[PDB]
Amino acid sequence: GPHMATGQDRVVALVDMDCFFVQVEQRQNPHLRNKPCAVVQYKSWKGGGIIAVSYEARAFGVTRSMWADDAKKLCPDLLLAQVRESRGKANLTKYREASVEVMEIMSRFAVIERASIDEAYVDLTSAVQERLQKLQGQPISADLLPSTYIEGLPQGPTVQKEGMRKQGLFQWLDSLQIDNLTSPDLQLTVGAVIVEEMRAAIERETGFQCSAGISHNKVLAKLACGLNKPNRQTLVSHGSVPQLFSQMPIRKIRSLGGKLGASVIEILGIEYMGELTQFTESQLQSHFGEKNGSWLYAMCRGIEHDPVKPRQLPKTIGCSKNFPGKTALATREQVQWWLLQLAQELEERLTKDRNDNDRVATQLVVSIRVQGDKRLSSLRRCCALTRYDAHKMSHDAFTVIKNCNTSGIQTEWSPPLTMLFLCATKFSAS
DNA sequence: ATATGACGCT
DNA sequence: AGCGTCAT
Ligand code: NA
Ligand code: NA
């Protein structure tokens, strides 16, 4: 009544760099700009695997994970940029460096959590408060929100996309409850102003565009982000949640896209997020466990407490390569040679990381996949990482996995390996 | 034959 | 420690 928490304490955004690897290649090669374009890894097998897709190409049905040969059938004029290949493996250094460029700009505006190479969560709570002070009581002009959509508006008693956007924004701002510096809706609005400014700076200083969502927590921010793309941002208010969730498939909510989300759908006989509200917290815990049940109970009401962690650097640095089909590794000599290739890239990236970020990794995780095993990893083993030395890391990696070899003759390697993965972890400040 | 990274469970 | 889950 006067006491239930409504999950409106924070202002949180999620920024997704639009088809990021494509933009990186389009910046470098202007001939690819404003065209149907994709980024592909490798080339011999069916033209290579597509890993990023321009919005012009998406309109022809081209998607990630598609074979480039198949993408060309959907989009004959598709332009392709190829991921750099180093030591016979994909090398993502150009995109990591671009990601760092963006993160350093974002950091000037608010607290950033690196979510992936192309996504960051943003905690705007303190930046909003400070901006509310500077603003004084001056009202928020629509000119400060030139790319913002207000989810759920316009509503109530013009057929162009941009006209609908401005209608909803005018309706939101007209209503906007500004006498109170503690209105959650006002705080979200100021957060959206800051994100416009942040996105403007990113585009001016790198050429890169992005989409964003602004709401009260990470899950709603991420959901908001996907509602209006590309190069747009969406504000999802607490009040918009009942209507938004009433037709929102459960699998669209972060962390419910897999087996848990499935189980929610099958056990409860529901399909939309909003249908979760009819269950008590105990009943959800009974089906899905105490933590998951409490989380679903809060989440279906728009409430989620996962903090934006102040960390722009990845916690682990890893290198992996799959060896599919007939390329699976079947000799001891192959296994050793590719462990060295992986270890040499890893030494390079670790040395750059130590100079850039004043830290050293202390543990080496070795993971492999054996042919026939659908799992990401068939086995993981760890050993100490004391020298940034490719030959020692690769030798040590072989040592900890060599006993997995089933074959009688140790010149051969059985069962064949379909993946090798080296990951450096357990960093210490250096 | 759709390269990574974070984190949960035990 | 080592495996399972979810994700970009
Ligand atoms: Na008003
Ligand atoms: Na309000």
Measured distance CA(A349)–CA(A346) in Å, rounded: 5
- Could you give the angle at the alpha carbon of A405 between the alpha carbons of A399 and A407, nearest 5°? 140
Cβ A421 to strand B below 7 Å: yes
Q: What is the CA radius of gyration of chain A?
A: 24
CA distance A388 to A360: 9
Which domain CATH number covers A349? 3.30.1490.100
Here the CATH number for the domain that contains residue A296 is 1.10.150.20
**For residue A319, which of A147, A51, A86 has the smallest C-alpha distance?**
A86
How far, rounded to the nearest angstrom, does the alpha carbon of residue A357 sit from its chain's CA centroid?
A: 22
Residue A378: CB atoms within 10 Å: 18
Given A231, A249, A267, which residue is the final one in a domain?
A249
Q: On chain B, which bases lie within 7 A of the protein's CB atoms? A: 1-9
Ligand 1 center from residue A174 Cα (angstroms): 5
Q: For residue A143, what are the domain limits?
A: 1-18+89-249
Distance from CA(A314) to C1'(B3), angstroms, rounded: 15
What CA–CA distance (Å, rounded) separates A209 from A111?
20
* Residue where one domain finishes, among candidates A70, A88, A106: A88
Same domain, A142 and A52: no
Determine if strand C comes within 7 Å of the CB of A379.
yes
Q: Do residues A286 and A224 both lie within one domain?
A: no
Residue A171 Cα to ligand 1 midpoint, Å, equals 10
Cis check: omega of the bond before A146, within 30 degrees of 0: no
The span from the CA of A160 to the CA of A247, in Å, is 24
**Ligand 1 centroid from CA A179, angstroms:** 9
Do A318 and A338 share a structural domain? Answer: yes
Residues 67-86 of A with CB under 7 A from strand C: none
Strands A210-215 and A233-235: parallel
* Backbone phi, psi, residue A112, to 5°: -115, 135
Task: Tell me if A422 sits within 8 A of A320, measured CB to CB.
Answer: yes
Q: Dihedral through CA A414, CA A419, CA A420, CA A425, nearest 10? A: -130
Nucleotide nearest to A48 (CA to C1'): B1
Residues A317 and A397 in one domain: yes
SS3 for A319?
A: strand
Residues A144, A276: one domain?
A: no
User: Residues of A annotated as binding site for Mg(2+)?
Assistant: 16-17, 118-119
| A206 lies in the same domain as A148 | yes
Q: Quick one: A139 and A149 in the same domain? A: yes
Statement to judge: residues A369 and A425 lie in one domain: yes
Strand C and chain A: which residues 9-38 have CB closer than 7 Å?
16
A210 C-alpha to ligand 2 centroid (Å): 28
Asked whether residue A312, judged by its CB, lies under 7 Å from any atom of the DNA or RNA strand B, the reply is: no
Determined by X-ray
- DSSP-derived 3-state class of residue A241: helix
Tell me the three state secondary structure of residue A370: strand
Count of the separate structural domains present in chain A:
4
Residue A2, judged by CB atoms within 10 A of its CB (0-12, 13-18, 19+), counts as exposed
Residues in the 5 Å CB sphere of ion ligand 2: A 177, 183, 185
Cα–Cα distance for residue pair A241/A277, rounded to 1 Å: 12
CB of residue A326 closer than 7 A to nucleic acid strand C?
no
Q: Are residues A270 and A239 in the same domain?
A: no
Whether A160 and A236 map to the same domain: the answer is yes
Strand C and chain A: which residues 201-240 have CB closer than 7 Å? none
How far is residue A305's CA from residue A88's CA, in Å, rounded to a whole number?
43
For residue A12, give the nearest of A130, A169, A187, A163 by alpha carbon.
A187
Bridge partners for A82 per DSSP: A40
How many other C-beta atoms can be found within 10 angstroms of the C-beta atom of residue A134?
7
Q: Cβ of residue A310 near strand B, that is under 7 Å?
A: no
Domain end position, chosen among A63, A88, A113: A88
Q: Which ligand is closest in space to the CA of residue A178?
A: 1
Q: From ligand 2's centre to the CA of A184, what distance in Å?
A: 6
- The alpha carbon torsion through A306, A184, A222, A37 (nearest 10 deg) reads -150
C-alpha dihedral, A330 to A331 to A335 to A338, nearest 10°:
-90
Residue A117 sits in the same domain as residue A190: yes
Name the region of A310 (left: φ>0; alpha: ψ -120 to 50; beta: rest).
beta
Among the bound ligands, name the one nearest to the CA of residue A184: 2
Backbone angles phi, psi at A182, to 5 degrees: -105, 15
Residue nearest the C1' of B2 (CA based): A65
* Separation of CA A7 and ligand 2 centre (Å): 14
Same-domain pairing of A200 and A280: no
- Nucleotide showing the shortest C1' distance to residue A65 CA: B2
